[PDB]
Structures are given as structure tokens and as C-alpha cells.
Enzyme design. Structure first.
Site, PDB file in Angstrom:
ATOM      1  N   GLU A 124       0.847  -1.195   0.000  1.00  0.00           N
ATOM      2  CA  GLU A 124       0.000   0.000   0.000  1.00  0.00           C
ATOM      3  C   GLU A 124       0.885   1.248   0.000  1.00  0.00           C
ATOM      4  O   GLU A 124       1.839   1.319   0.773  1.00  0.00           O
ATOM      5  CB  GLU A 124      -0.943   0.029   1.206  1.00  0.00           C
ATOM      6  N   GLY A 265       3.076   2.587  11.251  1.00  0.00           N
ATOM      7  CA  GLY A 265       2.863   1.705  12.387  1.00  0.00           C
ATOM      8  C   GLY A 265       2.650   0.247  11.978  1.00  0.00           C
ATOM      9  O   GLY A 265       3.306  -0.644  12.513  1.00  0.00           O
ATOM     10  N   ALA A 266       1.727  -0.004  11.049  1.00  0.00           N
ATOM     11  CA  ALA A 266       1.499  -1.380  10.558  1.00  0.00           C
ATOM     12  C   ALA A 266       0.659  -1.398   9.297  1.00  0.00           C
ATOM     13  O   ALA A 266       0.210  -0.354   8.830  1.00  0.00           O
ATOM     14  CB  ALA A 266       0.829  -2.227  11.615  1.00  0.00           C
ATOM     15  N   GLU A 268      -2.369  -3.822   7.007  1.00  0.00           N
ATOM     16  CA  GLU A 268      -3.418  -4.835   7.146  1.00  0.00           C
ATOM     17  C   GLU A 268      -3.449  -5.917   6.046  1.00  0.00           C
ATOM     18  O   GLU A 268      -4.521  -6.408   5.697  1.00  0.00           O
ATOM     19  CB  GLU A 268      -4.792  -4.144   7.207  1.00  0.00           C
ATOM     20  N   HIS A 301      -6.397  -1.769  15.238  1.00  0.00           N
ATOM     21  CA  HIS A 301      -6.600  -1.105  13.956  1.00  0.00           C
ATOM     22  C   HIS A 301      -6.456  -2.066  12.761  1.00  0.00           C
ATOM     23  O   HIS A 301      -7.342  -2.150  11.900  1.00  0.00           O
ATOM     24  CB  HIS A 301      -5.611   0.054  13.817  1.00  0.00           C
ATOM     25  N   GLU A 302      -5.350  -2.796  12.704  1.00  0.00           N
ATOM     26  CA  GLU A 302      -5.155  -3.691  11.561  1.00  0.00           C
ATOM     27  C   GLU A 302      -6.193  -4.805  11.567  1.00  0.00           C
ATOM     28  O   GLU A 302      -6.621  -5.262  10.500  1.00  0.00           O
ATOM     29  CB  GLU A 302      -3.741  -4.286  11.538  1.00  0.00           C
ATOM     30  N   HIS A 305      -9.570  -3.581  10.136  1.00  0.00           N
ATOM     31  CA  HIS A 305      -9.493  -3.510   8.677  1.00  0.00           C
ATOM     32  C   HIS A 305     -10.028  -4.748   7.982  1.00  0.00           C
ATOM     33  O   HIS A 305     -10.372  -4.689   6.798  1.00  0.00           O
ATOM     34  CB  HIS A 305      -8.049  -3.295   8.228  1.00  0.00           C
ATOM     35  N   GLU A 324      -9.929   4.236   6.290  1.00  0.00           N
ATOM     36  CA  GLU A 324      -9.045   4.683   7.361  1.00  0.00           C
ATOM     37  C   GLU A 324      -9.796   5.437   8.453  1.00  0.00           C
ATOM     38  O   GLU A 324      -9.626   5.127   9.615  1.00  0.00           O
ATOM     39  CB  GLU A 324      -7.891   5.537   6.816  1.00  0.00           C
TER      40      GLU A 324
HETATM   41  C1  LIG Z   1      -2.502   2.326  12.891  1.00  0.00           C
HETATM   42  C2  LIG Z   1      -2.071   3.674  12.344  1.00  0.00           C
HETATM   43  C3  LIG Z   1      -3.286   4.582  12.380  1.00  0.00           C
HETATM   44  C4  LIG Z   1      -0.976   4.248  13.231  1.00  0.00           C
HETATM   45  O1  LIG Z   1      -1.651   3.639  10.991  1.00  0.00           O
HETATM   46  C5  LIG Z   1      -0.568   2.823  10.593  1.00  0.00           C
HETATM   47  O2  LIG Z   1       0.150   2.262  11.394  1.00  0.00           O
HETATM   48  N1  LIG Z   1      -0.336   2.599   9.297  1.00  0.00           N
HETATM   49  C6  LIG Z   1      -1.295   3.055   8.376  1.00  0.00           C
HETATM   50  C7  LIG Z   1      -2.504   2.156   8.347  1.00  0.00           C
HETATM   51  O3  LIG Z   1      -3.589   2.615   8.039  1.00  0.00           O
HETATM   52  N2  LIG Z   1      -2.426   0.864   8.666  1.00  0.00           N
HETATM   53  O4  LIG Z   1      -3.684   0.145   8.587  1.00  0.00           O
HETATM   54  C8  LIG Z   1      -0.717   3.157   6.993  1.00  0.00           C
HETATM   55  C9  LIG Z   1      -0.657   2.050   6.151  1.00  0.00           C
HETATM   56  C10 LIG Z   1      -0.134   2.216   4.875  1.00  0.00           C
HETATM   57  C11 LIG Z   1       0.306   3.474   4.487  1.00  0.00           C
HETATM   58 BR1  LIG Z   1       1.034   3.735   2.744  1.00  0.00          BR
HETATM   59  C12 LIG Z   1       0.245   4.566   5.320  1.00  0.00           C
HETATM   60  C13 LIG Z   1      -0.281   4.407   6.592  1.00  0.00           C
HETATM   61 ZN   LIG Z   2      -5.387   1.601   8.431  1.00  0.00          ZN
END
Ligand SMILES: CC(C)(C)OC(=O)N[C@H](C(=O)NO)c1ccc(Br)cc1
Ligand SMILES: [Zn+2]
Ligand SMILES: [Mg+2]
Length: 889
Positions: A124, A265-266, A268, A301-302, A305, A324
Site C-alpha cells: 500500500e 505503524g502497521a 493490514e 486497527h489492523e 481492517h 481509514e
Molecule cells: C494504525 C495507524 C493509524 C498508526 O496507521 C498505521 O500504522 N499505518 C497506516 C494504516 O492505516 N495501517 O492500517 C498506513 C498504512 C499504509 C500506508 Br502507505 C500509510 C499508513
Molecule cells: Zn489503516
């Protein structure tokens, strides 16, 4: 520079039905063979077949097992593979390719890359095209059959989406695994992982179907003992989706994997969620308290998703906030239920009104559904995520829990297995809205403006009470400032959760009430109101707006002491502080401007200080809440209210106000610091990684907050407390002892001590780096240079780089040094980082976001550095677009 427009969405002239991948990992290169079973769609108009493919080295490409010839039948420019339409079949066909990529030198951490000794993907939003050719957009749904091969000693654990259907040995000490994932998915949800991974695992049985789900959590062997809390959070997440939303996990297995090098952060990926190590791994001995809520949030969060993102998909990237904002909202509900602390919601509001409000009044301002983009990476923003989440939460506020759950289920049941847009979600909520109002004429058409209109609304109030009529009126006005996205702003659907407090006894005077403000202004009248109330407005922070309560400080103090709603109490405190800050700021500013030899400052309200003391001394009051009331509003919150802000004057203003309150309350602070010790630092469950007590962590937050106040104040013999504190088992405590020791001669002794404690855990050392970076030191620039030479060096780990530099940029007095040396330093770091990781370089631009809010001299300094960055010949597309938008160029 091509700009993509939301209104230009058109379905592809092609279809990709099946992806069959062979990913062969070797020492110096990775070979990727791909067969795409494709078709012609009904929208096809005989166009060229164009694939995305970035940085691929072509060995061969074919259509129907016949080699294509470069130049005559196709062109490739390292970004797009173009096959001329005369060589494109008009029925079902097979496209195949073999490319070479190089994960080892992929420091951008997008596509396939090596993190320490682990091979991992991040697709992504546009990463899959860095692995193989594809029509790399989220509406291209396909089946995936994936084989991975690698050296068995180096990479014994092979993972991808779906079921592992084969494992096999390969000559030369290699092995392979085949994964088949029959359900359709977009390519950004593809993932592969290879490494010497160790795990913890458990079996979850779902609530209704009673399906057994295997849960696995993976890390490198060194940190496998840090996996337990993550596993517990995953179990909690699954239970919550079952209990609140009635949603069960549909696959037989879910893997979570920690890697050391990760941009966010992570992620999905379906059945294979991949995490920044700092958002999956923790232990009581080697993590600060913040890690436990961080892992809970990111794991949750993940997981959420899986429905809102993976099962219901996006049509296109302009719908990003639909997965999101909605998933952040789902995670917020989860975290609030798990922590059972009011500070969970308060912390989210505190972040929104500082960071996201700043963004929304900056040149970068955008609606949660943008109209255009150049680089999709640049729109994973706090606006799309956190304002998005507040917009998703307002549906719940408007509908109430029962009808919200009904609307949410309508959305899931109707769009499961399909792509969706923001309008589809609004549609489902609207059906619930009709059911709630009990008439099919009701609609949420105005609510759509929350998706399209940028900027933060301002909501202001006036009141009237007629004591003879027992009649109370709340007059409400809304306004959004014009910006570059809309010349004329329209009134929003704003839900205002309100209470009326009896000032004589602190009691509620009306039942739960949500005012629905749908016009530019309205008057809400209440009858049988026995006495003039104090209004409790936007309870729970019920809309993402600037609140102007027009209350006196006397009224605000009464709310702070006696209101039932945590946010209104917190906001009333915030408002008292802001009135004081603005007044003192202007008094300091005048004295500076006029070069006064003497002048007066308005003291802090004595009844306010008394109220703080009252709450601090209440043994039944919440420790988390207490830590908020003794802290001034964030600098980034304050800046939204000052033009041409002189940061030095603001630093002087904060200093004055903190000293005023401390001169009265320091003995109270000290007494509390001491009395809280027993419960805050209780070690009973220190070796039980599954036992997490959010109230106890809040008590430690309070102690560490008070200790900072007492240290800055040079409270008599506080250094003794600081030294004892450094001997605590809890890193939150002994890292606090480092930062508060900044005001003493013992700083570098604690610097060395805490370094020795931190250096042998990758993540702990990064927390140490943050602590040093954020230290209130006059010699902080020399200290940063020391961190660069002795610890950071030429690390390309984004966690390392972010830890050294970002906290320092919040040093109000030092980062904003009038020489511009701080701007110079971070601009050098951004440019250096942009050579290998444009995404993280854009993250490091964050301090520049407020550039046009500062005094004229600092504005010029910042603008000079941004223009310098913009003129770098090798600037990435991501960084160039970002700085072009930020500087209005
Ligand atoms: C959990 C938080 C809200 C801290 O967000 C993330 O840790 N990562 C984003 C995400 O939505 N993960 O599901 C993310 C993913 C891909 C990209 Br490109 C940018 C951002
Ligand atoms: Zn997300
Ligand atoms: Mg490292």
C-alpha cells in the site's frame, strides 16, 4: 507531474482474474516470475495495455507464451510498461514476465525489501508495481497463487496470504512454499515474508460459527519474549468486533509479523499483518508505558481492517478515509472499551486539535476526501485518518448506539465482497437515520459536506435566561473560513451533545440531548429550566470544531469541578488556560516591541489555581485527568490562535504561567508525587506480560508530570527524588529521570546510566534517543551532534532517524532559535533522508507545516530552507509535491 482527479474515475479496459507468482530470493537479487490471466473488460476501447512497473529489470515478457520484442511491440520507461494495442489480444489471454528486483538495497521500504535479516513486502498504496508488473489500482480484484523460494538456513519461515498448500526442498540448500488465496483481493493487500522468525501462537474460537482460528505472532528470535501483549490485544480485538459489531473473523489463520524497518505503524495485509516492531513488541522491563496503548491501538486497527478495508474494499484511492477514518473510529471504540479510562478519548481529541487543526489551517489543508493527488503516499494524513475518524464517530453520536449498529450492519451486508465509496456508507447511515426519525423523508445529504469541505468549522454561542418564564436559550452560530478548496463554505450538519448544569448543586437539569445544527445559525430554547444553568457543550467532543463557549472563567471553573463530562471539564480547563496565555503573550509582546524598562503581567486566576488544587487533592478523582489539568495546552494547539507567533514570547509566556501555578501548588505537587508512589510503581505484576493496568500507568504519568514540574521549579532537594526515580524498574520512570535531570548537574551521569540500560534492546534504545532529543538542555545542539556521531551514525532505520530528530523539533525555544540553525539542521536531515526514503523525508518535514504562522523573521528562515530543499536536483516526487503545496508554489 501528472495529477489524478477524483472526478475522472473510470473503470479499467482490462481485467486481471488470476495472479500466479514465483518469488525466488537469492543472495544478490530476487527473481520474480508472474503469469497474469487476463481479459478484456466492457469499457475497453482498443487501447494500449499499460502496466505499472517501477524499477523493474526485465528479463522477458510474453503474451500467450510468445516473447514480446522491445521497441516494436512494447516500451518500458522504468515506470510504465506499454504494450501496443495491435499486439493485445481481444479475448482472454495470459501475460507473463520475469523481472529482477533487489530487496537488499531497497531502503525506501516500499515493494519488497530487507529489514535486518527479514525479507518483507509493503504494497500500500503503490508498492506492488515495485515487485512485478500490474494494473496497480485497488479496483483490480484478482485471485493469487504465490510461490516463494529461498535459502533454508537464512529463511526457514516463508509466509504469504492464504493457505500454505505445499512445502518442498530445493537443490542447493533451498526450499519453497506455495500459498493459494482464492478469494479476490486488490494487489495492495498482497504480502510476503521470509526470515528466521520465532513465534507465539494461540487458538481463537469464534462467537457464533465456532470456527477455530489459529493466531500467530512473529518476531526475530532476539525479541520473541516481547510478543505476549500483542497476542492478547489480538484476542481482545476479535472479541470486540464480535461483541460490538457482531463480526467474526472469516479465515482459518491470522499472522502478525514485527520488522525493525517500517515506514508507518502497521499494514493490514490479508491474514498477514505486518508491523513496525515499535507497535507490536513490548515487555515491562524494556518498554515505556506508552507502548502498551500503542500496541493495543495498532493491533486493533489492523484487525478491524479485515472488514472495513479488506472485505469491503475501496473503489479508488480518493475513498481512503472510508477505510481509514472508519477503522480509526472502530479502533477508538475498542480502545475506550479496553482501557476504561477517560484519558483515551481525551488523548485523541488532544492530538486532533493540535496536529490536525494545524494541518487544516495550513496550505496543506484538504478535505477528508481530496479532489486530487500527485503522490498517494502524501495523503495518508491526520486529516484523512483522525478528522476522518471524527466524521465517522459523528454518525454514532447522531444515531445513538442501537441505530448506529443497524446502519453499520446495513453497510457491511450490502457491500461485503465489493468495492465501495464514501456515498455508500452515508447511504447506509441515512437508512438508519430514517428509521430513527421514523419517516422516510429524512436524509443525510448535507452530511456529505463533511467529506468534501476542508477547514475546521468555528462554532460560537450566546445565551439567554428568563427567570420568570423558566426559559433558557442557546444561540449557536457556525462558520468555516474560506481557503483554497472552497471560496464559499456551506453550513455543516453539526451534532452538539449538550447538558445543562445547575450551578447551585452541580446536577444535570435535562436528559441526554444532541442539538442538530444544520444552518448557519439557530436558537435552541428549553422550557421549565428552574434556574440559570451553565451549559456543558460538545460533550465527548461531539464535532471536530473550534469551540467558542463564551463562558466566564467562573463558569468554566464550575464545569471543571462539577460537570459530568470528561471532555467538557478538560475543555473548560483548556479555555481558561488559553485566555491566560493570549493575555500574557500580548503583554510580553508589547514589552518586547516597545522595549519597555518595566511593565505588568496579569496573574493567573487565583480561583482557577484553587480549583486545580481541589481536584488534585480529591482522592477519588482520576490520575490521568489530573495530569491534563496541570499541563498547559500543546504549543501546536496554541498556535492556531496567534498570528505571527513569536516563539520566544510564547516560551516566556508558558514559563510565567507555569511558575505562577507552581509558586502556589508545588508543595501539593510534591506531596502527591510521594503519596502516589506505592500504587503507581507496584511491582506485583511486573513479570506478567498479560497484565496491563491502564489506571496504574496513568498514575505513573501523573507522577512523572509532577516530577517534571517540580524539577523545572528547582523544588528544594528534588534532585534526591530524581536520583531515586532513576533506580525504578519501569523505563517510563527511569527515562523520565533522565529528562527531568536536564535542569541539574547530574544530567550526563543519568545520560550514561540510562544509555547503558537501553543500548541492548533495539526499541528501548530508540526510546532513549527520544528522551535525549526532547531533553530541555541549553546545549541540546551539541548533544544532538553527539547522538549523530556515537549512536545514530548512518542508520537508514526510520525509527532511529525519527527518534533523534522529531522530539527536538518540539523544543519551542531551541528548535526555533532565531539564527535558523534548527531549521537548517532538519532541512539537511530531510534532504539526506530523501535520497533513500522519500516517505520518511516527508514525515521529517512536519515542523515546517506551521511556517506561515510564525513571526516574519522565522517565516523567512523556514521558507528559505524549504526553497533550498526544493532546489535539490535529486529531490523525490513525494518531497517535491509536498513542499510545493506547503509553500503555495
Ligand atoms: C494504525 C495507524 C493509524 C498508526 O496507521 C498505521 O500504522 N499505518 C497506516 C494504516 O492505516 N495501517 O492500517 C498506513 C498504512 C499504509 C500506508 Br502507505 C500509510 C499508513
Ligand atoms: Zn489503516
Ligand atoms: Mg537497528
Amino acid at each position: 507531474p501528472k495529477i489524478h482527479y477524483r472526478k475522472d474515475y473510470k473503470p479499467s479496459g482490462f481485467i486481471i482474474n488470476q495472479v500466479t507468482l514465483n518469488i525466488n530470493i537469492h543472495d544478490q537479487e530476487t527473481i520474480v516470475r508472474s503469469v497474469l490471466d487476463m481479459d478484456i473488460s466492457k469499457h475497453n476501447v482498443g487501447e494500449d495495455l499499460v502496466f505499472d512497473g517501477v524499477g523493474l529489470k526485465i528479463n522477458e515478457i510474453s503474451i500467450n507464451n510468445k516473447k514480446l520484442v522491445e521497441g516494436e511491440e512494447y516500451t518500458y520507461d522504468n515506470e510504465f510498461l506499454t504494450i501496443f494495442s495491435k499486439f493485445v489480444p481481444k479475448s482472454k489471454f495470459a501475460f507473463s514476465s520475469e523481472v529482477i528486483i533487489h530487496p537488499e538495497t531497497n531502503y525506501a521500504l516500499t515493494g519488497l525489501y530487507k529489514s535486518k535479516n527479514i525479507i518483507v513486502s509493503q504494497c500500500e498504496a503503490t508498492g506492488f508495481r515495485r515487485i512485478t508488473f500490474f494494473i496497480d489500482r485497488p479496483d483490480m480484484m484478482a485471485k493469487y497463487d504465490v510461490t516463494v523460494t529461498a535459502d533454508k538456513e537464512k529463511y526457514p519461515v516463508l509466509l504469504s496470504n492464504g493457505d500454505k498448500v505445499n512445502e518442498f526442498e530445493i537443490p542447493g540448500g533451498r526450499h519453497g512454499a506455495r500459498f493459494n488465496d482464492p478469494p479476490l483481493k486488490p494487489c495492495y493487500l498482497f504480502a510476503v515474508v521470509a526470515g528466521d522468525l520465532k513465534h507465539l501462537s494461540a487458538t481463537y474460537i469464534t462467537k457464533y460459527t465456532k470456527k477455530k482460528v489459529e493466531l500467530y505472532v512473529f518476531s526475530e528470535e532476539k525479541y520473541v519474549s516481547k510478543l505476549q501483549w500483542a497476542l492478547e490485544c489480538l484476542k481482545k480485538s476479535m472479541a470486540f468486533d464480535e461483541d460490538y459489531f457482531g463480526l467474526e473473523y472469516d479465515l482459518s489463520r491470522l499472522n502478525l509479523v514485527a520488522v525493525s524497518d517500517f515506514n508507518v505503524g502497521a499494514m493490514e495485509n490479508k491474514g498477514l499483518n505486518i508491523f513496525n516492531a515499535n507497535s507490536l513488541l513490548a515487555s515491562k522491563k524494556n518498554s515505556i508505558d506508552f507502548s502498551y496503548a500503542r500496541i493495543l491501538t495498532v493491533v486493533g486497527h489492523e484487525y478491524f481492517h479485515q472488514y472495513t478495508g479488506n472485505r469491503v474494499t475501496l473503489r479508488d484511492w480518493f475513498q481512503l478515509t472510508l477505510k481509514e477514518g472508519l477503522t480509526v473510529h472502530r479502533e477508538n471504540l475498542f480502545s475506550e472499551e479496553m482501557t476504561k479510562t477517560v484519558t483515551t478519548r481525551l488523548s485523541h481529541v488532544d492530538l486532533l486539535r493540535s496536529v490536525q487543526f494545524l494541518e487544516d489551517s495550513s496550505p496543506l489543508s484538504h478535505p477528508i476526501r481530496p479532489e486530487s493527488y500527485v503522490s498517494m503516499e502524501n495523503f495518508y494524513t491526520t486529516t484523512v485518518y483522525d478528522k476522518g475518524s471524527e466524521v465517522m464517530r459523528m454518525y454514532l453520536t447522531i444515531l445513538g448506539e442501537e441505530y448506529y449498529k443497524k446502519g453499520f450492519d446495513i453497510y457491511i451486508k450490502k457491500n461485503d465482497g465489493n468495492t465501495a465509496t464514501c456515498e455508500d456508507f452515508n447511504y447506509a447511515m441515512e437508512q438508519a437515520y430514517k428509521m430513527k426519525k421514523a419517516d422516510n423523508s429524512a436524509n443525510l445529504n448535507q452530511y456529505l459536506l463533511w467529506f468534501s469541505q476542508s477547514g475546521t468549522p468555528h462554532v460560537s454561542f450566546k445565551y439567554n435566561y428568563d427567570a420568570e418564564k423558566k426559559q433558557y436559550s442557546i444561540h449557536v452560530n457556525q462558520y468555516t473560513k474560506p481557503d483554497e478548496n472552497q471560496k464559499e463554505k456551506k453550513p455543516l450538519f453539526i451534532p452538539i451533545s449538550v447538558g445543562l448544569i445547575n450551578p447551585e448543586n452541580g446536577k444535570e437539569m435535562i436528559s441526554q440531548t444532541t442539538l442538530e445544527l444544520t444552518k448557519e445559525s439557530d436558537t435552541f430554547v428549553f422550557n421549565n429550566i428552574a434556574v440559570k444553568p451553565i451549559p456543558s457543550l460538545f460533550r465527548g467532543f461531539s464535532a471536530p470544531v473550534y469551540i467558542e463557549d463564551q463562558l466566564t472563567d467562573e463558569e468554566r471553573i464550575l464545569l471543571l469541578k462539577y460537570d459530568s463530562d470528561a471532555f467538557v471539564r478538560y475543555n473548560s480547563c483548556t479555555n481558561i488556560y488559553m485566555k491566560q496565555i493570549l493575555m500574557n503573550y500580548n503583554e510580553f509582546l508589547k514589552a518586547k516591541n516597545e522595549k519597555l524598562e518595566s511593565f505588568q503581567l496579569t496573574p493567573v486566576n487565583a480561583q482557577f489555581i484553587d480549583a486545580i488544587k481541589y481536584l488534585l487533592e480529591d482522592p477519588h478523582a482520576d490520575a490521568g485527568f489530573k495530569s491534563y489539568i496541570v499541563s498547559l495546552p500543546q504549543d501546536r494547539y496554541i498556535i492556531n490562535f496567534v498570528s505571527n507567533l513569536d516563539t520566544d514570547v510564547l516560551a516566556d509566556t508558558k514559563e510565567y504561567i507555569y511558575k505562577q501555578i507552581g509558586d502556589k501548588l508545588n508543595d501539593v505537587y510534591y506531596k502527591m508525587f510521594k503519596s502516589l508512589e506505592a500504587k503507581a510503581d507496584d511491582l506485583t505484576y511486573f513479570n506478567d506480560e498479560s497484565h496491563v493496568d491502564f489506571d496504574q500507568m496513568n498514575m505513573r504519568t501523573l507522577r512523572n508530570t509532577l516530577l517534571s514540574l517540580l524539577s523545572k521549579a528547582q523544588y528544594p532537594n528534588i534532585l534526591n527524588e530524581i536520583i531515586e526515580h532513576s533506580k525504578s524498574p519501569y523505563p517510563s520512570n527511569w527515562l523520565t529521570s533522565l529528562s527531568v535531570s536536564a535542569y541539574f548537574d547530574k544530567y550526563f551521569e543519568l545520560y550514561d546510566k540510562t544509555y547503558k540500560l537501553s543500548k541492548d534492546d533495539e526499541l528501548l534504545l530508540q526510546e532513549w534517543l527520544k528522551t535525549v532529543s526532547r531533553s530541555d538542555r541549553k546545549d541540546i545542539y551539541e548533544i544532538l551532534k553527539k547522538l549523530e556521531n556515537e549512536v545514530l551514525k548512518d542508520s537508514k532505520n526510520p525509527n532511529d532517524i525519527r527518534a533523534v530528530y522529531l522530539p527536538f523539533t518540539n523544543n519551542l525555544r531551541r528548535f526555533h532559535d532565531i539564527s535558523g540553525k534548527g531549521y537548517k539542521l532538519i532541512a539537511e536531515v530531510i534532504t539526506k533522508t530523501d535520497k533513500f526514503n522519500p516517505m520518511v523525508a516527508t514525515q521529517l518535514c512536519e515542523p515546517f507545516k506551521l511556517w506561515n504562522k510564525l513571526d516574519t523573521k522565522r517565516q523567512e528562515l523556514m521558507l528559505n530552507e524549504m526553497n533550498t530543499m526544493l532546489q535539490e536536483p535529486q529531490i523525490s516526487n513525494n518531497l517535491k509535491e509536498y513542499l510545493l503545496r506547503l509553500t503555495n508554489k
